[PDB]
Amino acid sequence: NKCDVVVVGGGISGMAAAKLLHDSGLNVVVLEARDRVGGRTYTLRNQKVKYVDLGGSYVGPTQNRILRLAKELGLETYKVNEVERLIHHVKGKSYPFRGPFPPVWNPITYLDHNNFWRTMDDMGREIPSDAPWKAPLAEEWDNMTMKELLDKLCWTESAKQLATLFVNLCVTAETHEVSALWFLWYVKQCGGTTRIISTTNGGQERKFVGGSGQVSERIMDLLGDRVKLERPVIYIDQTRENVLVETLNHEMYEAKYVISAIPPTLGMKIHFNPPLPMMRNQMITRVPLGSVIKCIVYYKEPFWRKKDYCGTMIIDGEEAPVAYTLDDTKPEGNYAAIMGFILAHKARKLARLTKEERLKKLCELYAKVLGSLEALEPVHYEEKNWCEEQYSGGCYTTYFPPGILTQYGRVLRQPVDRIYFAGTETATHWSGYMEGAVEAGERAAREILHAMGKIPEDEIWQSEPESVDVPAQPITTTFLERHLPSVPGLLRLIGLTTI
Amino acid sequence: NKCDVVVVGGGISGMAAAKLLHDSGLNVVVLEARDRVGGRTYTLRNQKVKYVDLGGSYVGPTQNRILRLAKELGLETYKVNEVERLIHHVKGKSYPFRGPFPPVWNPITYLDHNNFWRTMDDMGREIPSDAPWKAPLAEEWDNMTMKELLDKLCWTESAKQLATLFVNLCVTAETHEVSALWFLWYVKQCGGTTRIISTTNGGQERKFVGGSGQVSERIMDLLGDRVKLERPVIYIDQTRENVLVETLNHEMYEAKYVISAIPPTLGMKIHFNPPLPMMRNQMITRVPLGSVIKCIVYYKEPFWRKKDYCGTMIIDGEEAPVAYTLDDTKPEGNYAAIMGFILAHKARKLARLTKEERLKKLCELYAKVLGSLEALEPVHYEEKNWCEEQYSGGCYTTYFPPGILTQYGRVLRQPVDRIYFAGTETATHWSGYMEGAVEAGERAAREILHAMGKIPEDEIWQSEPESVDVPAQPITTTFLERHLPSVPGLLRLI
Numbered sequence: 001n002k003c004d005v006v007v008v009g010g011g012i013s014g015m016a017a018a019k020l021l022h023d024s025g026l027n028v029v030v031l032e033a034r035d036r037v038g039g040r041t042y043t044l045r046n047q048k049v050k051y052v053d054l055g056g057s058y059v060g061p062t063q064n065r066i067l068r069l070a071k072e073l074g075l076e077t078y079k080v081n082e083v084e085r086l087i088h089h090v091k092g093k094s095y096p097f098r099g100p101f102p103p104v105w106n107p108i109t110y111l112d113h114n115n116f117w118r119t120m121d122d123m124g125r126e127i128p129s130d131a132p133w134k135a136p137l138a139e140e141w142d143n144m145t146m147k148e149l150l151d152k153l154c155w156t157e158s159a160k161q162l163a164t165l166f167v168n169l170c171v172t173a174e175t176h177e178v179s180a181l182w183f184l185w186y187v188k189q190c191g192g193t194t195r196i197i198s199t200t201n202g203g204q205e206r207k208f209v210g211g212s213g214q215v216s217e218r219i220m221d222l223l224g225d226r227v228k229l230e231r232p233v234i235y236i237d238q239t240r241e242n243v244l245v246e247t248l249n250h251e252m253y254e255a256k257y258v259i260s261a262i263p264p265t266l267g268m269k270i271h272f273n274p275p276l277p278m279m280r281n282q283m284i285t286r287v288p289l290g291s292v293i294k295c296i297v298y299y300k301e302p303f304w305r306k307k308d309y310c311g312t313m314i315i316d317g318e319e320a321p322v323a324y325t326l327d328d329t330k331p332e333g334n335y336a337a338i339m340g341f342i343l344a345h346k347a348r349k350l351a352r353l354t355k356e357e358r359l360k361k362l363c364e365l366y367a368k369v370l371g372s373l374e375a376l377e378p379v380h381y382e383e384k385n386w387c388e389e390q391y392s393g394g395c396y397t398t399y400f401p402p403g404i405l406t407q408y409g410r411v412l413r414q415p416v417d418r419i420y421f422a423g424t425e426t427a428t429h430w431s432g433y434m435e436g437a438v439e440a441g442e443r444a445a446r447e448i449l450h451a452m453g454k455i456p457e458d459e460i461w462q463s464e465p466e467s468v469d470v471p472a473q474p475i476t477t478t479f480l481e482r483h484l485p486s487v488p489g490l491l492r493l494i495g496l497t498t499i
Numbered sequence: 500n501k502c503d504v505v506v507v508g509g510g511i512s513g514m515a516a517a518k519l520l521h522d523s524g525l526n527v528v529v530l531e532a533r534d535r536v537g538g539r540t541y542t543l544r545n546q547k548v549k550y551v552d553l554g555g556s557y558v559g560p561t562q563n564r565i566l567r568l569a570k571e572l573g574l575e576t577y578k579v580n581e582v583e584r585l586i587h588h589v590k591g592k593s594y595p596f597r598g599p600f601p602p603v604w605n606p607i608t609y610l611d612h613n614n615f616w617r618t619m620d621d622m623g624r625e626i627p628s629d630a631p632w633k634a635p636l637a638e639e640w641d642n643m644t645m646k647e648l649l650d651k652l653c654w655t656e657s658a659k660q661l662a663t664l665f666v667n668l669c670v671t672a673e674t675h676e677v678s679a680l681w682f683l684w685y686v687k688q689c690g691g692t693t694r695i696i697s698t699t700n701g702g703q704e705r706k707f708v709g710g711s712g713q714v715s716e717r718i719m720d721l722l723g724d725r726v727k728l729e730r731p732v733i734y735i736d737q738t739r740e741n742v743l744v745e746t747l748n749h750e751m752y753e754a755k756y757v758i759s760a761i762p763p764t765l766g767m768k769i770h771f772n773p774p775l776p777m778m779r780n781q782m783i784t785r786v787p788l789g790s791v792i793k794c795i796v797y798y799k800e801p802f803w804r805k806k807d808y809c810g811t812m813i814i815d816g817e818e819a820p821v822a823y824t825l826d827d828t829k830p831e832g833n834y835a836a837i838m839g840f841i842l843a844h845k846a847r848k849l850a851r852l853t854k855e856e857r858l859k860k861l862c863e864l865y866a867k868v869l870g871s872l873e874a875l876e877p878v879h880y881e882e883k884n885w886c887e888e889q890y891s892g893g894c895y896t897t898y899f900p901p902g903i904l905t906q907y908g909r910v911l912r913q914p915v916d917r918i919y920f921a922g923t924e925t926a927t928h929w930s931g932y933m934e935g936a937v938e939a940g941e942r943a944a945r946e947i948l949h950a951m952g953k954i955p956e957d958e959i960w961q962s963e964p965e966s967v968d969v970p971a972q973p974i975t976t977t978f979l980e981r982h983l984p985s986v987p988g989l990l991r992l993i
Binding site: 143144145147148174176177232234235248250265266268269271272275276277278279281282285286287288289291345348351385387388389390393394401402403404407 | 642643644646647673675676731733734747749764765767768770771774775776777778780781784785786787788790844847850884886887888889892893900901902903906
């Protein structure tokens with residue numbers, strides 16, 4: 001019934017918001033649609049796997065907010081295995097390598113690859129993290145798909161294929177589905193290409209011992225009965241002095257303010273009185289989430305290590321169901337496992353199969369890529385298709401099709417009377433991630449504290465001290481990386497000399 | 500409480516479905532979110548306008564279902580005024596013309612324009628009306644925006660600006676927002692470019708005397724208390740023997756079957772048990788509706804007619820708030836008016852202004868295009884911004900961004916257990932229009948009749964006899980239109 005703030009959604013973002021408010025002495029309620037907290041994080045426990053993250057899992061350097069929250073809750077991280085060699089599998093063959101990017105020998109191809117990544121980051125620097133629509137060429141970039149941009153930029157099929165995989169993997173959508181402006185923003189606000197793709201020194205460096213779902217679960221423990229499970233919100237009424245929030249199971253909640261901590265499009269599941277303003281009304285119909293199945297195949301031993309493979313596979317090819325894998329073995333060295341993502345159109349295509357059929361296709365792929373018959377001997381399998389989730393809409397996050405971020409992006413976190421907007425989608429640093437969920441939940445909560453006259457305006461946005469447990473090495477480039485010509489640049493040099 | 504079929508939504512499609520089922524002897528209930536019926540149609544009545552369509556309004560030849568339904572309800576049409584010359588306003592000057600297409604004089608530009616329209620219809624011939632995802636090049640065409648297609652096809656800025664205006668007006672969206680496959684399908688399923696753009700012998704030939712809102716209002720009259728207003732549906736439970744449908748005002752309905760006659764994305768406003776299957780679950784987040792404000796400026800007389808202008812204006816350029824107008828004067832010749840559409844990004848931009856600020860911009864525009872100071876003296880103004888409607892999502896209809904139709908298009912009308920799908924978006928002929936709303940509503944109703952064993956499978960989809968009142972003339976092309984080369988074609992020959 002009566003409280004200071006109702007938070008809609010008990011994922012990391014809503015729970016971080018509720019905790020902050022609770023810690024500040026306010027009376028909060030969390031209204032969660034599902035029979036569990038965690039949302040796009042979900043840690044399955046059974047005897048075969050012990051624990052496994054079937055949703056968000058990875059954390060890394062520069063993600064200081066999630067690291068701080070988890071440490072305060074008594075959680076610890078461990079490093080994802082990247083001791084041995086990575087594999088780039090292309091045109092039916094495997095090429096082992098070290099470092100975050102697959103090496104390229106052909107000098108033309110080398111230049112094209114170098115220019116592709118460099119240009120991603122060059123364009124990114126033009127895009128304000130907190131206002132991507134303010135980029136000087138926001139409109140021109142927003143009116144193009146990533147596919148169109150890759151077609152202009154990549155002078156080799158090799159670079160174009162790798163760039164395509166990079167997009168599909170970062171945002172679980174096809175290159176023709178997404179805005180170039182939005183994608184360039186998304187990479188930049190994670191710190192750029194190197195930080196986003198890297199295991200060591202990037203986003204995939206670590207996982208939480210015991211699973212990421214513990215973040216949301218432990219906050220729930222702190223909040224006690226203030227968290228209401230199986231209360232999907234259906235109705236928000238702001239016509240009266242206090243805000244009225246109604247649930248599907250016919251409960252009514254009365255609040256001074258509301259935090260919406262749900263994916264933006266899932267706002268459509270709530271009926272608003274008075275109606276939302278036009279821009280938000282239309283925005284929430286324009287912002288789909290991507291498509292992914294996260295699959296974990298268990299083995300007797302981490303046999304790939306014995307062949308000096310760390311477990312990371314970057315797999316290019318339409319026939320490959322999985323484009324990317326990581327070693328998911330426990331830090332103790334047991335429950336040997338490979339985690340793989342089935343991405344974008346393949347999530348759609350392969351969802352038609354049975355679980356046993358998907359396991360078979362994955363094992364046969366892994367056996368080929370690792371050149372290892374032992375890959376055909378799994379001991380266990382778990383998977384989760386996030387496309388089927390009514391209360392998520394997809395994973396990992398929301399993508400913006402061409403034309404949408406410039407027209408509608410400014411209203412993403414704009415308050416609507418006494419409703420404030422959290423959720424990873426509204427973050428300005430690691431939006432799409434557990435990090436962004438914490439940033440947005442805490443910012444939303446402080447927006448309310450400000451409105452109540454409890455903190456000054458300048459305290460709404462707060463910086464985060466760097467983690468001492470997970471230090472960040474700076475992203476650096478070599479002189480050659482900076483100044484090597486692109487393929488057309490080299491061609492210009494050739495035409496000029498012989499003139 | 501209990502009935503045979505619950506129809507969710509009281510727009511034309513929901514109403515047509517309910518009437519068909521009711522007429523066949525089933526007990527139907529229509530659950531309508533708003534305090535009115537008609538949905539994306541809405542006829543306002545006041546003394547200043549008598550009546551005005553602020554939503555869907557136009558009907559024309561080959562739209563036989565809406566015409567038959569309206570005729571049965573006692574409605575009549577009248578012809579939109581196209582007696583005098585049309586105007587194409589380009590680079591700040593007005594060029595009057597006759598016929599559906601504005602003439603082009605530069606011979607190179609002429610070839611480019613001719614090629615564009617012809618190419619739209621050529622491509623459409625390979626897209627099945629009932630399955631666009633089966634086009635031989637479905638994926639290639641779906642993976643490109645209309646912007647990319649126009650960039651490839653249009654060698655002149657002249658053709659490209661007109662093509663862009665065409666896209667904007669047809670689907671109230673930007674060329675870069677929409678799939679080329681989906682847009683080409685949309686045009687082809689209205690009968691092609693000439694049929695879609697034409698007033699005389701096309702989709703804008705006619706309006707209903709007294710307003711199109713009468714169609715839904717008169718069906719509501721027929722159904723009596725079977726229509727429940729202010730009953731937004733929030734919850735559909737299919738786990739039990741009977742389907743349970745819950746409304747926002749706490750009421751429960753029980754039925755054998757359900758028809759969803761709301762825009763696809765507005766399915767998101769309903770919590771489903773069991774959850775929807777994966778493809779529909781994601782589909783309904785991928786399918787926005789366009790952006791439009793419909794604006795009608797009233798004058799003492801239809802003064803443009805005195806200058807041999809019919810009131811149709813095609814207006815190029817970024818600065819113009821409205822790119823297209825039609826004469827909205829009553830058939831009696833009174834309530835003189837010009838209807839215009841503020842489209843796509845301009846709807847978003849200009850929504851920030853006041854009603855009076857929009858009136859001033861339109862009037863000054865019309866004064867310039869019509870070359871008349873009389874345009875600066877409006878007697879009255881009505882407008883409707885459809886972007887603000889919680890229970891429409893936009894107007895005129897749902898558009899598909901790149902990649903969506905091939906991936907999710909199959910699920911649009913696929914039944915979910917005992918829920919069947921109506922709504923103009925599910926139609927296969929004039930989808931997006933009131934005609935499509937009738938086609939889909941009746942088809943969905945007949946799918947349920949068939950599921951009940953009352954009619955055979957071959958009666959689910961039914962042809963419509965041609966209207967005697969609004970007969971269609973054939974679409975023709977000339978020898979030169981068919982065989983003149985494109986710009987690159989003229990270059991190959993050089």
